């Protein structure tokens, strides 16, 4: 019964719930919380909502309708709730209760200031999978000669690694205390400059690695993908990134019956639904950034740590058009917050300039998560039709031949027209 301080539950609409069998029960009138986003969030979130509403109306008529429910984070939260209220508890309360949500990007200051609200949401909700499909749409400009060979899905660990935010600033009493502990109690001799020295900590665990790699292997099973590649810098970081690799291979053996492939260290098992062989292998992270460019055909599902996945997501997105057409999801079983790969691009904020494609395709992922496949298919149809008409935002316009420039809202208009 309890109302919120600033959130308003829609007058019509019903909550998604988790069914007894752990699937989602999605009402025909579902409530979906959304965060507008800082910066270019104002440019891309409102067109996304229109595009979703248009796909839902065309696929289902009067029968289904999303009840969008705004919830607040970032600058808009400090506007609505007051100074320093960057992430109100009721924002998180509502996103958990209503199960499925979507957010624009949020700003994280460099070198000081608040810790990332995007990480804060992921960790509070324990959305330990960051899932980022890398897909080439025909006609999108690419820096690469054969962008269609790039077809990958990134499983980025989303709850630990150096993203844990554990660090102390140079010359503070706390950093001096940590350095004294390291040098005097742990016998650390390898800090080259212990004065005026910032210190960060990187935790990587068996349980955290296990649940991320298990999800990635299951995805490969459920989507008929042939390879899962563990990406790590385990020669230099032996006990974090190297342990990630070892624990990941153990998941294949322990939970999917994998055995050594051709002497190891790669592993193999047979897809339990199709009988086709899935290979689990591993690549050192720096070498991997070359391999995705020179041999993208050899990779399918990627499983990697928090930091590595962040870097790799942008490197791969660049091959298929950039982070203007790069969607994502933060997932824990059925709970999910859909989210573009890109940030707040503050130099463009409010200009109606940037590509809403990333957040729109994140909504496409949201619709499939809800089982609303017909509406999701119309989003893809509209996207393909708008690209084929070459009515595109500035990031595509500059690479295409004979294209017509449209605004962020103008690109949403073009998608709806082609549904």
Ligand X SMILES: NC(=O)C1=CN([C@@H]2O[C@H](COP(=O)(O)OP(=O)(O)OC[C@H]3O[C@@H](n4cnc5c(N)ncnc54)[C@H](OP(=O)(O)O)[C@@H]3O)[C@@H](O)[C@H]2O)C=C[C@H]1[C@H](CC(=O)O)C(=O)C(=O)O
Closest CA to 283 of 264, 302, 257: 302
The single residue among 159, 300, 344, 352 that binds ligand X, judged by CB under 6 A, is 344
Between 267 and 354, name the residue whose CB sits nearer to ligand X.
354
The string over 326-339, giving b where at least 16 C-beta atoms fall within 10 Å of a residue's C-beta and e elsewhere, is bbbbbbbeebbbbb
Between 240 and 358, name the residue whose CB sits nearer to ligand X.
358
Between 127 and 204, name the residue whose CB sits nearer to ligand X.
127
Output the smallest distance, CB 407 to ligand X, in A.
Answer: 12
The single residue among 45, 91, 101, 118 that binds ligand X, judged by CB under 6 A, is 118
**What gap in Å lies between CA 412 and CA 410, rounded to an integer?**
5
Structure tokens at 205: 């665990």
Tell me the HSE value of 154 on the side-chain side, using a 13 A CA sphere: 31
Residue 345 assigned to a binding site = yes
Angle at 135 between CA 131 and CA 26, to 5 degrees: 50
Other Cβ atoms closer than 10 A to 410? 18
Residue 394 assigned to a binding site = yes
* Active site (annotated) includes residue 176: no
Mask for 295-324, x = binds ligand X (CB under 6 A) = ---------------x-----------xxx
Output the smallest distance, CB 361 to ligand X, in A.
Answer: 11
Between 150 and 308, name the residue whose CB sits nearer to ligand X.
308
The single residue among 308, 358, 362, 391 that binds ligand X, judged by CB under 6 A, is 358
**What gap in Å lies between CA 133 and CA 223, rounded to an integer?**
12
Catalytic hit among 76, 103, 214, 233:
233
Residue 91 interacts with ligand X (CB under 6 A)?
A: no
Q: Phi and psi dihedrals of 37, rounded to 5? A: 105, 150
Q: Which residue has the tokens 């065309």?
A: 58
Output the smallest distance, CB 358 to ligand X, in A.
Answer: 6
Stretch that binds ligand X, among 86-94, 196-204, 338-346, 361-369 (CB under 6 A): 338-346
The string over 53-67, giving b where at least 16 C-beta atoms fall within 10 Å of a residue's C-beta and e elsewhere, is ebbbbebeeeebbbb
**What gap in Å lies between CA 179 and CA 194, rounded to an integer?**
7
* Active site (annotated) includes residue 93: no
State the helix-helix crossing angle for 285-294 and 306-319, rounded to 10 degrees.
Answer: 20
The single residue among 59, 318, 354, 387 that binds ligand X, judged by CB under 6 A, is 354
Catalytic hit among 126, 286, 298, 333:
286
Output the smallest distance, CB 16 to ligand X, in A.
Answer: 23
Output the smallest distance, CB 141 to ligand X, in A.
Answer: 12
DSSP letter for each residue of 11-54: SS-B--EE-TTSSEE--SSBEEEEE--STTHHHHHHHHHHHHHH
Q: Cα Rg for the chain, rounded, in angstroms?
A: 22
Between 64 and 342, name the residue whose CB sits nearer to ligand X.
342
How far out from the chain centre does Cα 129 lie? 8
Between 47 and 88, name the residue whose CB sits nearer to ligand X.
47
**What gap in Å lies between CA 353 and CA 44, rounded to an integer?**
9
Mask for 38-67, x = binds ligand X (CB under 6 A) = --x---x-----------------------
The single residue among 140, 342, 367, 411 that binds ligand X, judged by CB under 6 A, is 342
> Containing H/E element for 124?
helix 117-124
* Active site (annotated) includes residue 171: no
Catalytic hit among 98, 128, 136, 163:
163
Output the smallest distance, CB 72 to ligand X, in A.
Answer: 14
Residue 173 assigned to a binding site = no
The single residue among 106, 154, 179, 212 that binds ligand X, judged by CB under 6 A, is 106
3-state secondary structure 323-365: HHHCCCEEEECCEEEEECCCCCCHHHCCCCCCCCHHHHHHHHH
* Active site (annotated) includes residue 286: yes
Per the CB < 8 A criterion, the answer to whether 138 and 70 are in contact is: no
The single residue among 57, 108, 205, 407 that binds ligand X, judged by CB under 6 A, is 108
**What gap in Å lies between CA 194 and CA 178, rounded to an integer?**
11
- Would you report the helix, strand and coil content of the chain in percent, each value rounded to 5? 40, 15, 40
Structure tokens at 190: 């390898």
Structure tokens at 370: 């809800």
Residues marked as binding for D-threo-isocitrate?
Answer: 116, 118, 122, 132, 156
Residues marked as binding for Mg(2+)?
Answer: 310
Catalytic residues: 163, 233, 286, 310
Residues marked as binding for NADP(+)?
Answer: 107, 342-348, 355, 394, 398
Residues marked as binding?
Answer: 107, 116, 118, 122, 132, 156, 310, 342-348, 355, 394, 398
Binding site for ligand X (CB under 6 A): 40, 44, 105-108, 116, 118-119, 310, 322-324, 339, 341-345, 354-355, 358, 395
């Amino acid at each position: 019964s309890m109302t919120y301080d600033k959130i308003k539950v829609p007058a019509q609409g019903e909550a998604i719930t988790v069914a007894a069998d752990h699937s989602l029960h999605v009402p025909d009138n579902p409530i979906i919380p959304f965060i507008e986003g800082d910066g270019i969030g104002v440019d891309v979130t409102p067109p996304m909502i229109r595009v979703v509403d248009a796909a839902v109306q065309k696929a289902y008529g009067n029968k289904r309708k999303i009840s969008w429910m705004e919830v607040y984070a970032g600058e808009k939260a400090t506007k609505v709730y007051g100074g320093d209220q960057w992430l109100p508890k009721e924002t998180l309360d509502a996103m958990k209760k209503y199960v499925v949500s979507i957010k624009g990007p949020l700003t994280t200051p460099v070198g000081g200031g608040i810790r990332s609200l995007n990480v804060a949401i992921r960790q509070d909700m324990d959305l330990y999978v960051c899932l980022r499909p890398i897909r080439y749409f025909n006609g999108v400009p690419s820096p690469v000669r054969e962008p269609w060979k790039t077809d990958m899905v990134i499983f980025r660990e989303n709850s630990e690694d150096i993203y844990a935010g554990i660090e102390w600033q140079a010359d503070t009493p706390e950093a001096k205390k940590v350095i004294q502990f390291l040098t005097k109690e742990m016998g650390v001799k390898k800090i080259r400059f212990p004065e005026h020295c910032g210190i960060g900590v990187k935790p990587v665990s068996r349980e955290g690695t296990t649940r991320l790699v298990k999800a990635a292997i299951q995805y490969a099973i459920d989507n008929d993908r042939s390879t899962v590649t563990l990406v790590h810098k385990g020669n230099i970081m032996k006990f974090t990134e190297g342990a990630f690799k070892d624990w990941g291979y153990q998941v294949a053996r322990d939970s999917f019956g994998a055995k050594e492939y051709q002497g190891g260290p790669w592993m193999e098992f047979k897809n339990p639904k199709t009988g086709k062989q899935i290979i689990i292998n591993d690549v050192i992270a720096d070498a991997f950034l070359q391999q995705i460019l020179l041999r993208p055909e050899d990779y399918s599902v990627i499983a990697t740590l928090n930091l590595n996945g962040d870097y790799i997501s942008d490197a791969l997105a660049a091959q298929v058009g950039g982070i203007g057409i790069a969607p994502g999801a933060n997932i824990s079983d059925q709970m999910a917050v859909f989210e573009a790969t890109h940030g707040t691009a503050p130099k463009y904020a409010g200009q109606n300039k940037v590509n809403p494609g990333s957040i729109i395709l994140s909504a496409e992922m949201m619709l499939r998560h809800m089982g609303w496949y017909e509406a999701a298919d119309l989003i893809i149809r509209g996207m393909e039709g708008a690209i084929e008409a070459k009515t595109v935002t500035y990031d595509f316009e500059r690479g295409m031949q004979g294209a017509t420039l449209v605004s962020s809202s103008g690109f949403a208009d073009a998608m709806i027209k082609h549904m």
